[PDB]
């Protein structure tokens, strides 16, 4: 309910510790278009314990929601947000076309296409370095074979 | 003495939940088997019959329920499910969505 959300290029990550994880409130903000849990039960959330809890939030397209799952590929998975092959959690997604859409174009939310390799689980990618696709290098200004990675 | 043949349609990654003692959406809130179930589980891919190019929406699975289903019990109730912290008069709206 922050009324503001970040892109998958700079997805937020909140620390959850020294607090009572009251999971009885998440049912009041979204209709749960895609509520998929992997390592835990939807009802046993209030009857378990964990070492540390992390809540990652970002904005992606509708076709990219299926990539937020263990063992998935794609631009969001391999280059923006990678989940481990043994992830134990729940994924929550809901439509935001009524709130996060602008008639003049909401160019705020971005995403990285590909940067020379795939990413590791739970890591950031904020380096805005120019991407090189050819044999001759290039820096500073974009151009032929020197495309922005976003 | 008596043989019961239960028939239904689920996805591929949900066939493993039909085994006894499993945990999941199909095992808990859709179809639960006891820990001492005696019988055989049979499943085959019917994508050629139970799928449409525009989407076959005639098959439904219960997402969330008040509690896990008892073994060999059925819940055909299509009543809207309340999930929020405030009453919704049993009608579709905020904090209250369809269970199926």
């Amino acid at each position, epitope marked *: 309910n922050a009324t503001t959300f970040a892109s998958v290029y700079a997805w937020n990550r909140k620390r959850i510790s020294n607090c009572v994880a009251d999971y009885s409130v998440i049912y009041n903000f979204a209709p749960f278009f895609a509520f998929k849990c992997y390592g835990v039960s939807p009802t046993k959330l209030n009857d378990l314990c964990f070492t540390n809890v992390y809540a990652d939030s970002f904005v992606i397209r509708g076709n990219e929601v299926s990539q937020i799952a263990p063992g998935q590929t794609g631009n969001i998975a391999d280059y923006n947000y990678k989940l481990p092959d043994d992830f134990t959690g729940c994924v929550i997604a809901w439509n935001s076309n009524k709130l996060d859409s602008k008639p003049s174009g909401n160019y705020n939310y971005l995403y990285r296409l590909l940067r020379k390799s795939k990413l590791k689980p739970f890591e950031r990618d904020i380096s805005t370095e120019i991407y090189q*696709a050819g044999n001759k290098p290039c820096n500073g200004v974009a151009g032929p074979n020197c495309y922005s990675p976003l | 003495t008596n043989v019961y043949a239960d028939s239904f349609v689920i996805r591929g990654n949900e066939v493993s939940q039909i085994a006894p003692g499993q945990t999941g959406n199909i095992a808990d809130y859709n179809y639960k088997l006891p820990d001492d179930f005696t019988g055989c589980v049979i499943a085959w*891919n019917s994508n050629k019959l139970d799928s449409k190019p525009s989407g076959n929406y005639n098959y439904l699975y219960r997402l969330l329920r008040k509690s896990k289903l008892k073994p060999f019990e059925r819940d055909i109730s299509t009543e809207i499910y309340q999930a929020g912290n405030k009453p919704c008069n049993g009608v579709a709206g905020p904090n209250c969505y369809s269970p199926l």
Partner: antibody, heavy 123, light 112 residues
Framework: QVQLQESGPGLVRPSQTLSLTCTVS??????????WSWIRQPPGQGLEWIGYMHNSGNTYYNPSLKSRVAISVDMSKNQFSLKLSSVTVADTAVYYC???????????????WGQGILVTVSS | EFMLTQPHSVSESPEMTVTISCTGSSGSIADNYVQWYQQRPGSAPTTVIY?????PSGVPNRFSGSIDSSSNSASLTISGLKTEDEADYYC??????????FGGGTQLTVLG
């Protein structure tokens, strides 16, 4: 690694049934997450899809010659067969085996292709 | 019936960048995956771009795939041509009825 190999008569005649079979090595044909397809490539033209078949018996065909194709699968010998019907002089091409990946969220590339067999149709 | 149309011939001097694109006419290009198969003349095809953004291990990083949803087309960017890159590239996708759709075939060659 996994590899495929065509096998069948390299020369047929019209008014007959083109029968082929691909021997699979390095993997079981009874394994799911994979379809077993047949790709056609006439000499000088592009590729043409004939049809893939799942191990569960679900056989998907090409609408161009669906009424003149048939695919089978044998879990014992790890070989899937192709059987056309009413072959013509235009059906001669290089047939390639291919295993498609049906693993994640969608159908995807033919990861492993065979060596390709060139057959001709002439009476 | 979903179809894919790509240029018949593409030619450019070495060390430059080419572009082969396939446009879907009777359907969408984002509903199914698009794959590019580099078929060397006289040998079987081989996947170089799959899942519209992924390249298999061993294939040089000179290849890259892209998807254009506004134009309903799928392009292939090859920067830094080489002598062995004179093979044919086939753009393949799937119809909504689970029918594999192959492109027309594009002959790429370096201007030696």
């Amino acid at each position: 690694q996994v590899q495929l190999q065509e096998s069948g008569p390299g020369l047929v005649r019209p008014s007959q049934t083109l029968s082929l079979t691909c021997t699979v090595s390095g993997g079981s044909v009874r394994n799911e997450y994979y379809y077993w397809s047949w790709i056609r490539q006439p000499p000088g033209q592009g590729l043409e899809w004939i049809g893939y078949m799942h191990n569960s018996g679900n056989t998907y065909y090409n609408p161009s010659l669906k009424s003149r194709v048939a695919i089978s699968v044998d879990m014992s010998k790890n070989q899937f067969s192709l059987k056309l019907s009413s072959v013509t002089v235009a059906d001669t091409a290089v047939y390639y085996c291919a295993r498609v990946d049906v693993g994640g969220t969608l159908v995807s590339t033919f990861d492993h292709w065979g060596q390709g067999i060139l057959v001709t149709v002439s009476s | 019936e979903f179809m894919l149309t790509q240029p018949h011939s593409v030619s450019e001097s070495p060390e430059m960048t080419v572009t082969i694109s396939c446009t879907g006419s009777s359907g969408s290009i984002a509903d199914n995956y698009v794959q590019w198969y580099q078929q060397r003349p006289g040998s079987a095809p081989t996947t170089v771009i799959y899942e519209n953004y992924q390249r298999p291990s061993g294939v040089p990083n000179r290849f890259s795939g892209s998807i254009d949803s506004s134009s309903n087309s799928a392009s292939l960017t090859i920067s830094g041509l080489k002598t062995e890159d004179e093979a044919d590239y086939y753009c393949q996708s799937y119809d909504n009825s689970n029918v594999a759709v192959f492109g027309g075939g594009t002959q790429l060659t370096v201007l030696g």
